[model samples]
Target: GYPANYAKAPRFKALIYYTQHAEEAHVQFAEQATTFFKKLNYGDGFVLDITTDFSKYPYEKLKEYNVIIMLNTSPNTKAERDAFEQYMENGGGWVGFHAAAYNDKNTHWPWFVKFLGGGVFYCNNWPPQPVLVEVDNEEHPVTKNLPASFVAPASEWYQWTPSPRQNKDVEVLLSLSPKNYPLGIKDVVNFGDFPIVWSNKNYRMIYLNMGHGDEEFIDGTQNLLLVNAFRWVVSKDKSGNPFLK
Candidate 1:
C-alpha cells in the first residue's frame, strides 16, 4: 500500500506545448525536448504537464502554472493568443525555442511582435550545422556558468531583422560570432547580426534559436545552456522562486 505522504507537492508548475503535426525535424526536436525537460522534472522537481493543444489551457487554467514552455510552436487562434498574451503581461514566465518564436510579416500578432522586442525572422543557413556561439552576458544567471563561447549543436540558426539587440528592453545573452560568417556552403548566410539567445527585460521570458533537429540535445554545453534557461525562467516567476523552496 502507498503511504499517504508518498505523494509530494511540486515546487512549481510548468505547462509544455508542442506542435504535433509539424515538420518531421521539428517534431523530432520537440520529442527530444520533452524527454529532456521531463528528466529535469524528476524527483518532484516541479509539476510538469505536456500537451499538443493550447486551447485546453485558457486563462483560468493557464494562469495556474508558473511558467509556460513552448517548443516549436506558438498560439494559433485568437483565444489562445489572447490568453498567452494576458499571461505574459501579468508576469508569467515563458521559455521558447527556435520556431516557437518565429514571426514573419504574416504572423499578424502585434502583441507578440513587441513581446519579442520587435524582431522578425530574417534568414537562416541551409543544411543545419554546428556553429560557434558567443556569450554576451556571463553575469546573468542563465549564462553565468557557460563558457564565453562554444560550438553549439547542428541547428538551422536564425538571424533576426531589427535584431532583438536593437531593442533597449532586450538583453541578448548569446550570439553567433562573426567568425562564422559565410556560415554555409549552399544556402549561405554571408553576414548579419545573429543574436541566438536573448530575453526581454520587461518580461520573464527567454528565447533561443537551438531547436531544429535531434542533434540539439547532443552537446553537454548546449544542454547546460538550456538547463540554465529553464531554471532561470522558473525562478523568475512572480509567485515565488521555486529553487528557494
Candidate 2:
C-alpha cells in the first residue's frame, strides 16, 4: 500500500552537458561526477547521461530527460541557448553548477539573468581552497540531511551582486561561513553574505557554486548534498508534475 503511485511513476533521467572550454580541473570533476552518479544507481529508478555537444539535442531530444545538468557550460550559441530557455519555461528541471550560471553585464540573455536571481558573477576567492560552509535552510530537501556547517571542498567560491537572497522567489540553501572571512590567499572574499546554493522557487532547479576542482567529490558529506539535489529536482508528485515548491 505504501508508495501507492510507484507502479505508474515515470522513471527519472538526467542529462549532464559539460563544456569543453572548462579548466582541466573542472573537466576532471565532471568525469568524476559522472562516475559517482552511475555508482549511486538511484535505486535503479534513474538514468544518468553525459554530453559535450549541446547542439545535438534540441527540444524534442531533451524531452526524454527529467533534468538537465549544466556542468560548466558557458558562452553557448544563441540557438543552443534558446532551446534550453524554452525547455525551462515549459517546466523542465535544471541543475546548474559553477561557471554554468556565470554571467556579467555582457551576458545579454535577459530571461536567464532573472532566472538566476539577477546576480552578476562579481568576484571569487583565488587558487581554489576549502572553506567552511553554513547550511542556511536545514529543512530544505537539498540540505535536510547535511549538518549545520561543514568544510566544503576546494572551490573558487563566487559571490554575487544583489545577493540571490534578495530575490523574492529564491530560497538560499547554503552559504559561505563567516568564519572563513578573508577566505583566500590572493583574490579574497573578505566579507559578504555569500550564498553557495539556492533555488529559484518558481522553477524545478538549483544552482551550486562548487564545481571548480578535482577534489569536489572526495568529501562524502558534500557528495551527499549533490545527490540530494539531483534527487529532489527529478522527483515528481502523484499527478506526474515536478515536485517543486
Candidate 3:
C-alpha cells in the first residue's frame, strides 16, 4: 500500500543488475523489480549490481547513470563485450529482460542479434500458459495505459525469427497470440506475431520477451508493463524524442 504518488514524488534512478547465479529466477526478478520500483515512486537510488563475475564492468562507468539495467547479462568479456558496444553507441538506455534475449551458445553477437529483434528462436518447455497479449503500440508511452489483449498468466514459450530489428528499426510493442500458443512451426522460425514488446528507432533500445521467472513479477499486468518499461526507456530521445533531439 504505497502508491499515493510515491509519498510525494520525484524519484527515478535505478540500476539493478542481478545474476549471482542466474537462477532462483534471477533472484526472483530482482525482488520483483526492486519491489515494484519502490512501490511506484521509482525509488531514486538503486544499484544492486550482483554477478557470477563474467568480468566486465566499466561500461564507460555506464555513462554516469540514467538507466542501464541488463539484469541477467552474458557478455563473458572483451571488457563485457566492449561494454555492450559502448552503451549502444553512446545513446545509452536499455531495459532488456528475460534471459536477456538469448545468445547462450551461438555467441556470435552481431550487435546482439540486432539488439534482440530476434535471438533465441525456439522454445518449448511448454508449461506456463495463458498468453494472448497484443498491443502493437497504442500511442506509445509504453502502450499508453495498455490493454488490447491481456492474459499473460505464465510465460516461457518463445518463437522468434526473421525479426532482426524488423523494419523501421523496431517498434513492435507487444504481440503473440498465434491463436494462443499453437506449439511452434511456421516458416521454420516464426515471428508471425511473436514480439512481446519492443523499441529501437533509437529510443536507445528496450525489449522484453516476458521475464520468464517470477511469473512476470507477480503479474500485476506484468508489473505494470515492467514499470512502464523503466519509464519508457529513460523517457525517450535518441529518435523517439520526448524532447530535445
Candidate 4:
C-alpha cells in the first residue's frame, strides 16, 4: 500500500555526518556533499544516512554501518567520541574531508591525533583557491587510478606538522605540488611538505583535505579522487568487500 525509495538489501550503508555550526563555506560544502553522495545510491546500490549529531549513534548502533563519512565535523560529546573511537579501533570504515580533520594545539584528543598519524593542523593558504596536486603513492587502491598530477578545485589546504609522511603507518596519497610553493598572494606558503590526502595503515580510514566553498565539486578529476577514496574504504570493510556481495 506504499511506494518508497528506501534501498532494499543495499550492498552497504554509510553514516554521513556534518555540522551546521561551522563556517558558512564549510556548511555549504557539507550540503552539496550530501546531494552528491545521495546520487551514488540512486540505483539501490547502497544506503545513505545523514546526521548532524553523533549522540544518536552509540557504539552498538554505530557499528551497524559499513562506513562513516565525516563531511565537515567529528564527534562532539563524550559518549559520541567514545563510540567513534571504539568503532575505529574495532575496524569501522571512515572517510573524512577538510575541516572534519582539523585540529590544533587546543584540540586535546591525544588518541585522535595518534589515530590521524600524529599530524596536527599547522598552516594553510589563504582565501580558498585551486592548486596543482601530485600523487605520492599511486600503487594503493585509492590513488591507483589518479594521474601523476592534476589541479584540484579551490579549497583551503592544510599542511600538517612533522608531515604525516614521517609517520611510519601513514601513506600519503596526494600532496600539494611543489609548484604551488608561495601558494597564496596574501598568506603565502613559500616552503615545506604539504599533503592533502592520505590514509593511516592502522585504520580503515582516509582523510581528504578538500571541503570548503561551492567550488569543491566543480572538478571532475578531484571528484573521481573522492569516489576512489570512498570505494577504497568500503572495499576494505572487515566483514569483506560490500561491493563484492
Q: Using lDDT, give the best candidate's number.
A: 1
Alpha carbon lDDT of each predicted model:
0.90, 0.83, 0.62, 0.89
Give the TM-scores of the predictions, in the order they appear: 0.95, 0.90, 0.30, 0.95
lDDT, candidate 1, equals 0.90
Candidate 1, residue 197: how far the Cα is off, in Å: 0.5
Which is superior by lDDT, 1 or 4? 1
Model 3, 159-237: lDDT tens per residue?
A: 5566534556777888776666454333232335577677766547777776555756656776778878887777663
Evaluate model 4: give its lDDT: 0.89
Candidate 1 ranges beyond 4 A from true positions: 1-8
**Clashes within 3 Å, all models in order:** 0, 0, 1, 0
Worst 10 residues of 4 by lDDT: 1-10
* List of clashing residue pairs for candidate 3: 174-197
What is the C-alpha lDDT profile of model 4 across 1-245, one tens digit per residue?
76544434788889999999899999999999999899887886888899998888998999889899999977767788899999999999999999888888877888888888898888888978999999988798878888989989898888888799999999889999988888986778889999889999999999999999987888889989989999999999989987655
- Residue 193 of candidate 4: its Cα lDDT? 93
lDDT score of residue 44 within candidate 3: 32
Lowest summed lDDT across 10 adjacent residues in model 2 is found at: 236-245
What TM-score does structure 1 among the candidates reach?
0.95
lDDT of 3: 0.62
| lDDT tens per residue, model 2, 127-146 | 89999999998888889889
Segments in model 2 whose C-alpha atoms lie over 4 Å from true places: 1-10, 42-44, 236-245
